[PDB]
């Protein structure tokens, strides 16, 4: 009995984790454009608003490789508020 | 007889059945009628920091009606 | 009203401390065996909240049943004082309250009270386990009547 | 090449191993003084350990010494029979049928038969009081505490052939040398008819609980081993040597009464 | 929130500060029972319950030993340990001050980054994995059974050899 | 290695984790695997020496998806700055560094 | 992570400045030596784990079977210095200096 | 509204240990042929408010010959640690879920140990040493078999989360496939949570209230309070891992009332126990439990290793 | 921070339990039940001495089994591996070596204690 | 036999531990390789798509699964359902 329903719990799973595969691309779709304008949404912030100080470049990164960094929390809302801040960093950690 | 011990259990037994039930009804409060929706993985969390993003801050409710 | 209020904490402090007083594992005579028949399914200690703990710091009340010696006596008062202080105790025996027979030996104490002060006396050679039984009764409440709030607010 | 701070170093052994016997351990004095429940309330049994197993042991039994064979000097020979109880304060009546006979031995006396057969009645009822308060408090000390609880309500009504027939319950100077004081009442004997034909049932119901477990099987056997020939050197003569092989007993042996 | 690991790094610092000054062997366990703890939430504030916990198991039963020696070979009439002396009790509140001092020094000197106190908090997981199953540690550590099992055959062998190596030292 | 017993024999005993971006356990990545593959594809053949002079670029880029140390600075200048600029004003922060926005 | 390090190599070099001066006692040393170690489990584990380099997640296990394999080896030589002398002070083995 | 779950939590736990502390000296007693408590409330019922009440006055004796730093943590640590391990404990949705919930459970068990050490430690005194030393030798006999007898159950499971089990008992309880796990589960329950017939640590016949006996009543209540508080949890886990009683999610307060059912029993079971064996003389334990116990665990290891694999019963992680 | 609410609670129930256990029992210590017990006597010696075990063996074995049972513990992912058959060896070799250490061992009188 | 047989017979009266572990060591590793079921261990665990599968792009070749899951083409398990 501990045969035929541990086998039931993994085609139950696969119905589980192919219902995920059907929606990677809209959260991925989802999460390219929102990291993407967080990031543009904090150069303007950085462009003329902020940033008349001598020589430095805005948009300025720090790599010769010209490919595409993900961007990471310390970047990514890193000047929002520290909730924002504090919720990945310790989000999921801390017990949902 | 022996059936002066049932007090001692009977009373005991409306002790721990509270830590039990109290916790699903303290629960489905807060949560809006559902369960705590617990995140074992970094996926259930997205999905709730998701839908923590598609209504006011609180994340146990709005789904379709909007478009 | 301060008094009476005092005086229903006074009598609620005692019911903890005579319901649940916690006997020490004493022994040394004959008369220790009137105790087992105590702690028996005749004239149950438990059923009255007593307990037998064998450490004076886990103790409510020592209950000396047998002859003191002279020897001995260090052994008693080194133990009487070593619990805390709501400490009773209760002399069993003729032996313990003034060294029945014995009285005139040589390494016997002609009483418990002697070296530790006591709150009660129960008499018999070998007492009946019905009464030691009638003594941790009454010293059960020989503390009932005892006014250690009231006595702080007229102080 | 030696310099003032090396001329101390005298040279090493040869085979690398030097002498330093120091017997330097002590062993932790412990004693079980007369309030652990171990020791039946008086005894102190001073110890010297090493961890806790055990490699000398030394009883100051003493702590309960009162003086009753000094007296006796200055009481009659019924004026100190109730001395005899309090020796063996677990079984009275078998005292009080030894001083009852060294006494009638001196006068050259026999009590009557009636007398003789009551004398061996409580003479072997005293052996039940007893091992009972043997095979159950060396189960407390053990941890098994119910058939402790189990006989003493069986213990008390053996309490009451005594208070039935003397007046206190346990101290009963009843088996004096003028034979035995006073004669039972009409409705004892058949008391213990309805008590002995129960009591072995008990033993069943605590002989099952202890003679086949593993624990108490695990926990006395193979302890005390105290051989045969040097039982006797000690002096034992009770039940430590025929509980080694020794056949001796004064009932069969030496039949008194 | 954001001063959290800054708080367990310091108090784990600590607890290996006291565990340096050599009180009794008591003193010091106790010293990693609680650096042990603290290690637990540190390696657990970076994700991973799984690597914490090991050595709040390891370290349990390990210093339960500890314990057990030390009350029969190292511990002496007195112990001696903290309140005991102003040796130690100097270089305990020494060292603290110490590091108010040291963290404060070059937090001035803010070039080489070594402590950002303005900077703090923001910087502690780096992209991690949002969108994403299956990612914990203790899969890490389960790869003791598919692609490095040399890792898993040559601990084990300590672990046969130490049982072996052991009672030839105890002999 | 010296008594290099495991290319004579072929087999990986351990030389396939390395480094960073080598056989995950199921298939994730390790925070730099396009920069470690991009520094060590270029320095093979090549070895040492000269994988220390024109194999920088690669290594100097390596250095900062894995330290990410001039990503601190030229987000501690901007605090800096900003914790400068205001206190003594001339800046007020959006609704969406503040706090409300509108989530997506 | 750029603030633990610091702290947590600064906790190593305590313990390795606390097993380079003794204080009569052969068994906090050995103690002194298992922080030591274990700064390195944290300093190790977090290197794979912000990095996410789960590849190398065996290791902090491996670090740490010999850490009490050494621990093993370390308690069980006082028995030895206890057995000849009882007392565990380190000043009291000096004899090989002859 | 979270303080009010903990509220409801704690309370009633706390309520239930006094009330084990009366069930503990009356069911003994009705098989000692003698009555408990029956006269300070109806049938006993108010006997532990005198007893917690009666301690709360007397003189917590703070000895001559101590370290009273470490003897006022042990009690804080150890009514701390078995009263903390019902956070995650799941009446079917728990306070605070946990993937690995269940090495929660083995560390802070482990310290359950440090406040009988440093306790005994502390206190100056022949008698607490060895009680002290009792639980070394002890938690060394057991704690290796804690985990394996906890593994290999939790092998032919995923997760190490309680939770998941609630859904591998969703047919079915794992007595059937592991009771001789639950066997040495039971006497593994029973090292851990000291309270036994193998006790060696409290010994009142050899080392006379043991790791306790300098303590006086206030600290000393925090032991009773944490040790029949833990007699509770390592038989609700007997409730979760082997005995697995009804979710149906619809009415969840049928998983909690079955719960109950057994859990009794498995509080009630260690009952008979004290009432009826006696101790282990502290050699045949550690000679009872890695060579009795210890190959017959890695025996069963092993067959729970290649039970799914021979046939294909792999838990999932969820 | 979930779990800060519960457990910074249980230490304030056993910290406010005992400040009042110390401050509402009328105390009055003197000199002679502060000093220790030993059983109504004064003790010879010192309650701090080397007490010489005599599990010293199994205490080790212990110390080596506990990394073994840590070890151990990542079965239930690497059940979930796609080989399953060097998981499947190698846990045979692991448990199999163990009791060969521990079957060594107890033949050479390790659990025995020394007597 | 009888020199060997019968000595497994006070080690399972007496000693009736070791017998079930030294069986059950055994009887463990030699399960598997005499099951029908084994093969599917390594199969069933490989089936679960925990990370996404990427798409290769049509080039004129691999006739497998075209750009339709429900295609009859591919790894179409129904070995798990009726197992
Ligand atoms: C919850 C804790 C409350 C404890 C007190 C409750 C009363 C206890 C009780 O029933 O007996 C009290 C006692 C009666 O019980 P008792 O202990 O005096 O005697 C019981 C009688 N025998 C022995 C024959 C069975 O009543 C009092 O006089 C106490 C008065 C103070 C109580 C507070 C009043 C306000
Ligand atoms: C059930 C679990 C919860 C446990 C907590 C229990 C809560 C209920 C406790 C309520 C009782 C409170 C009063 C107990 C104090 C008893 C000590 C005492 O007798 O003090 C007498 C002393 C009397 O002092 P005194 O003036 O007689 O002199 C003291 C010294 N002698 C006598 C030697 C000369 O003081 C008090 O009156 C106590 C009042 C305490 C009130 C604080 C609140
Ligand atoms: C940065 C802040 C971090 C703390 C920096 C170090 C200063 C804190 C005090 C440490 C030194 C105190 C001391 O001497 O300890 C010995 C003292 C010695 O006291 P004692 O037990 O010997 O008794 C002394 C008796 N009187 C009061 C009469 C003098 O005991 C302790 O305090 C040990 C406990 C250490 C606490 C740290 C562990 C956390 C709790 C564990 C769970
Ligand atoms: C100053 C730093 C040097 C170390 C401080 C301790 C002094 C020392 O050298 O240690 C000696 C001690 C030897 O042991 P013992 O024989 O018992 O000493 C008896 C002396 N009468 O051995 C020991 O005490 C062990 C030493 C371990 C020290 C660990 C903690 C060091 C933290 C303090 C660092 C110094 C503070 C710097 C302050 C900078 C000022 C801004
Ligand atoms: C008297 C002395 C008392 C001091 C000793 C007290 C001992 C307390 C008991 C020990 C705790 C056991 C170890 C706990 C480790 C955390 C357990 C865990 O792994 O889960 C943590 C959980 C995240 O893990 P997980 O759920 O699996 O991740 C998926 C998301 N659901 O969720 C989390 O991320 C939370 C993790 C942090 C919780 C740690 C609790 C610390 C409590 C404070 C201790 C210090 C006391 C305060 C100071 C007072 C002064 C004494
Ligand atoms: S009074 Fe009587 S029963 Fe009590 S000890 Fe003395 S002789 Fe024995």
Known sequence: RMMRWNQERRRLLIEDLEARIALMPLFQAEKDRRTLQILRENLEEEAIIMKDVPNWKVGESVFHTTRWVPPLIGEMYGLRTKEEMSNANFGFTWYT | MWFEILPGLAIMGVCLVIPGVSTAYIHKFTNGGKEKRVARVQYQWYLMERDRRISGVNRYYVSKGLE | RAEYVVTKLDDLINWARRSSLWPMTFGLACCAVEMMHMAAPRYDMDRFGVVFRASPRQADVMIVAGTLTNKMAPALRKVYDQMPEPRYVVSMGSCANGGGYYHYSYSVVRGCDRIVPVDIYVPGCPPTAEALLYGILQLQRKIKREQKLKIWYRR | ??????????????????????????????????????????????????????????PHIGLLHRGTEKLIEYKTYLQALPYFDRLDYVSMMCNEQAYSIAVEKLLNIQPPPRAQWIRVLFGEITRILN?????????????????????????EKMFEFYERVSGARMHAAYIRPGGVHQDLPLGLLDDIYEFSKNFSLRIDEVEEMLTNNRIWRNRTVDIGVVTAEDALNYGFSGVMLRGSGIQWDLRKTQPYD | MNNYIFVLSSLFLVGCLGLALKPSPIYGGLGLIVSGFVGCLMVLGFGGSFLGLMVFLIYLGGMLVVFG??????????????????????????????????????????????????????????????????????????????????????????????????????? | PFLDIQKKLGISLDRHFMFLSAEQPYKNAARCHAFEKEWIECAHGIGGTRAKKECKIEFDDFEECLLRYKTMRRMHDIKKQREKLMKEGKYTPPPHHSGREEPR | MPSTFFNLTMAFSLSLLGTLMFRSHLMSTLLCLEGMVLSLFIMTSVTSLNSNSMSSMPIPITILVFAACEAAVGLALLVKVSNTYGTDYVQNLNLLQC | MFFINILTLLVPILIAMAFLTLVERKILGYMQLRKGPNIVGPYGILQPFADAMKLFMKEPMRPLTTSMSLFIIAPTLSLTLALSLWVPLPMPHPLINLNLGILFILATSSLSVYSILWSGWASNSKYSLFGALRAVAQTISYEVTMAIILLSVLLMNGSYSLQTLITTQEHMWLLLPAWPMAMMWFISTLAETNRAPFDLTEGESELVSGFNVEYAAGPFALFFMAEYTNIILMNALTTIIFLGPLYYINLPELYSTNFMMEALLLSSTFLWIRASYPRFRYDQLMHLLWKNFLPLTLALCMWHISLPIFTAGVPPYM | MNLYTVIFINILLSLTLILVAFWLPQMNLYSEKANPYECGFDPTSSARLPFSMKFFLVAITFLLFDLEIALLLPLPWAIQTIKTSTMMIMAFILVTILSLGLAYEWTQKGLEWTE | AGRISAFLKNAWAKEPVLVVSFSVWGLAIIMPMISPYTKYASMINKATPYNYPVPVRDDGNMPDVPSHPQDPLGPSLDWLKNL
């Open chain 4, 1 to 58: 090449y030696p310099s003032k701070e090396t001329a101390h170093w005298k040279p090493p052994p040869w085979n690398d191993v030097d002498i330093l016997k120091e017997k330097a351990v002590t062993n932790m004095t412990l004693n079980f003084g007369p309030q652990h429940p171990a020791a039946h309330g008086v005894l102190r049994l001073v110890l010297e350990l090493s961890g806790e197993m055990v490699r000398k042991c030394d």
């Open chain 5, 69 to 171: 020696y030390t009350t029969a070979m190292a511990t002496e009439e007195y112990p001696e340990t903290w309140g005991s002396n102003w040796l130690i009790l100097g270089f305990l509140v020494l060292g603290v001050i110490m590091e108010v001092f040291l963290i404060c020094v070059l937090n001035y000197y803010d070039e080489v980054g070594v402590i950002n106190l303005d900077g703090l908090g923001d910087w502690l997981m780096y992209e991690v994995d949002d969108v994403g199953v299956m990612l914990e540690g203790g899969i890490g550590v389960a790869a003791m059974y598919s692609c490095a099992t040399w890792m898993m055959v040559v601990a084990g062998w300590s672990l046969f050899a130490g049982i072996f190596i052991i009672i030839e030292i105890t002999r």
């Open chain 4, 131 to 155: 091992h009972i308060m043997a095979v159950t408090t060396h189960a407390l000390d053990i941890g098994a505490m119910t058939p402790f609880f189990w006989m003493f309500e069986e213990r």
